[PDB]
């Protein structure tokens, strides 16, 4: 009912002689090599809509028929998406048949309104000792993961998936926003290897839905794939009533993708180089991650800091939304401590005695003070001598040396290649232990 008028890169103008589709509506380009979905970005006037493509626009002719679907991008949601890989528009890219859809939900949504929100602000028990004690996770909060390569980030991802599905019975979505395909395939096969994704007839016993928008996809496809993972998570929250885990892999790449689609639509960039709508394009994603009265979504978002500059507007806008950081360190991982959570640089907003109680708060602050007290005399031990200072100083050395060991923990998804059986640790046992 509409026809292609302009093709400038990933940005397509479609002309409708009838009535226009709504903004954010999905349009199918009729007749192409692959499925070319456009998303309506604005109404330009003169019966033209301005759209941003989710695939390549090479091979597109002015006058090609374009069918309006009457809705935004609609993705399959439900338990039939578990253990599958979807792209942004809902197609299975894991090459394992179709996707058994419980429903087909619009990826565009308003945030859960004020009457639906939870005022409780409670803790998500994750079964990991260093995470439950020092930097707890809010049920419904956003958690920044400052990991990287070789610090055991993927093992921590799969263990949050495993322990949340085991304890609270909630499912997980992994939104690979702009990830390399080698890393995405590595995470896929490592999830198959660790048992959190099962193939074939045992597919229903998977705990994780992968939603992959790869790095070679256009900026419109990388900018919307986090919303697709959000929609898969919001079905489990709002229909299944679960405590969902969402993993936005590199929230900075979400920011960078939305900045690219804002630059391509001819908008003036704001500060340093970002989109003028940076705070609202980030808050539109992050405000749908909340606790409703039905269930919750807890989001573990990997955060990249652009020039090692925390005052850059993309991490400064992301850190307004974060409720906890868990910094994974290489120096923690080179003491053989796993998980490699830095016990002193990880923070949490949930660490004050009005949400966790004075017992848990004072245990965590004592542990953190003891490790800090050991940390600022290691230039006194290595310079003047190991047994040089007092016995009380060496008492804090021994106590922090054994607490620094005690934060390590064997993981249940790591047992298929390490042999050591993984051990879920409860919260009150962690408090009474430390």
């Amino acid at each position: 009912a509409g026809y292609v008028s302009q093709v400038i890169g990933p940005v397509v103008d479609v002309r409708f002689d009838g009535e226009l589709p709504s903004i954010l509506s999905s349009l199918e380009v009729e007749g192409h090599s692959v499925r070319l979905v456009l998303e309506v970005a604005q109404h330009m006037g003169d019966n033209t809509v301005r759209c941003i493509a989710m695939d390549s626009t090479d091979g597109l002719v002015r006058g090609q028929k374009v069918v309006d679907t009457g809705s935004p991008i609609k993705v399959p949601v439900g338990r039939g998406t578990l253990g599958r890989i979807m792209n942004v528009i809902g197609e299975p890219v894991d090459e394992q048949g179709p996707i058994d859809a419980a429903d087909i939900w619009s990826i565009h949504r308003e945030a859960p309104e004020f009457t639906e929100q939870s005022t409780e602000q409670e803790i998500l028990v994750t079964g990991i000792k260093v995470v439950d004690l020092l930097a707890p996770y809010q049920r419904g909060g956003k958690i920044g993961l400052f990991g990287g390569a070789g610090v055991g980030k993927t093992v921590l991802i799969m263990e949050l998936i495993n322990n949340v599905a085991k304890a609270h019975g909630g499912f997980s979505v992994f939104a690979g926003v702009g990830e390399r395909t080698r890393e995405g395939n590595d995470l896929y096969r490592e999830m198959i290897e660790s048992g959190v994704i099962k193939l074939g007839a045992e597919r229903g016993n998977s705990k994780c839905t992968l939603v992959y928008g790869q790095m070679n996809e256009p900026p419109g496809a990388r900018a919307r794939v986090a919303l697709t993972g959000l929609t898969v998570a919001e079905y489990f929250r709002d229909i299944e009533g679960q405590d969902v885990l969402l993993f936005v892999d590199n929230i900075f790449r979400f920011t960078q993708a939305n900045s690219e689609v804002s630059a391509l639509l001819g908008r003036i960039p704001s500060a340093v180089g970002y989109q003028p709508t940076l705070a609202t394009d980030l808050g539109g994603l992050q405000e749908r991650i909340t606790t409703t009265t039905k269930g919750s979504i807890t989001s573990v978002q990997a955060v990249y800091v652009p020039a090692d500059d925390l005052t850059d507007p993309a991490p400064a806008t992301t850190f307004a939304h974060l409720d906890a950081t868990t910094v994974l360190s290489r120096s923690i991982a080179e003491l053989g401590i796993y998980p490699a959570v830095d016990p002193l640089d990880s923070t949490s907003r949930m660490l004050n005695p009005n949400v966790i109680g004075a017992e848990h708060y004072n245990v965590a602050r004592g542990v953190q003070k003891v490790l800090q007290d050991y940390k600022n005399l290691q230039d006194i031990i290595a310079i003047l001598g190991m047994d040089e200072l007092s016995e009380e100083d060496k008492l804090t050395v021994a106590r922090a040396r054994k607490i620094q060991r005690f934060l390590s923990q064997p993981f249940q998804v790591a047992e298929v290649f390490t042999g050591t059986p993984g051990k879920y640790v409860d919260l009150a046992d962690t408090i009474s232990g430390f």
């Binding site: 002689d17 006037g45 003169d46 019966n47």
Partner: protein, 114 residues
């Protein structure tokens, strides 16, 4: 295909149409015929409100706008240069250029009468 040469040169996109409308009216010696064809449409916009709505309203469909002008410029008053100009100006929605394509047409006409 080379046309008659214009008497004076003019600026663009509304006087560039008049420079060409003059050239395909000096090919058939219809310089004075299409001039009052232009002047009658200046007058028709002073009379009719649904004719000037086809040049100001952006919400009239371009299918309608090119089929009102084509369906009234038939069987009388055509001149086949006027009849093809105002169906070309209605294709692109440029019927509002009719006032200044007329003004720059006179400036070629008055420099043609020397």
């Amino acid at each position: 295909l080379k046309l008659p040469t214009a008497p004076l040169q003019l600026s663009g996109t509304s006087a560039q149409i008049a420079t060409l409308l003059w050239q395909v009216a000096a090919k058939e010696n219809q310089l004075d015929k299409v001039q009052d064809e232009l002047y009658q449409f200046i007058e028709l916009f002073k009379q009719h409100s649904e004719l000037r709505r086809l040049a100001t309203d952006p919400f009239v469909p371009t299918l309608v706008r090119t089929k009102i002008i084509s369906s009234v410029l038939k069987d009388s008053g055509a001149s086949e240069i006027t009849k093809k100009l105002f169906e070309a100006l209605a294709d692109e929605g440029a019927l509002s250029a009719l006032l200044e394509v007329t003004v720059n047409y006179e400036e070629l006409m008055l420099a043609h009468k020397k």
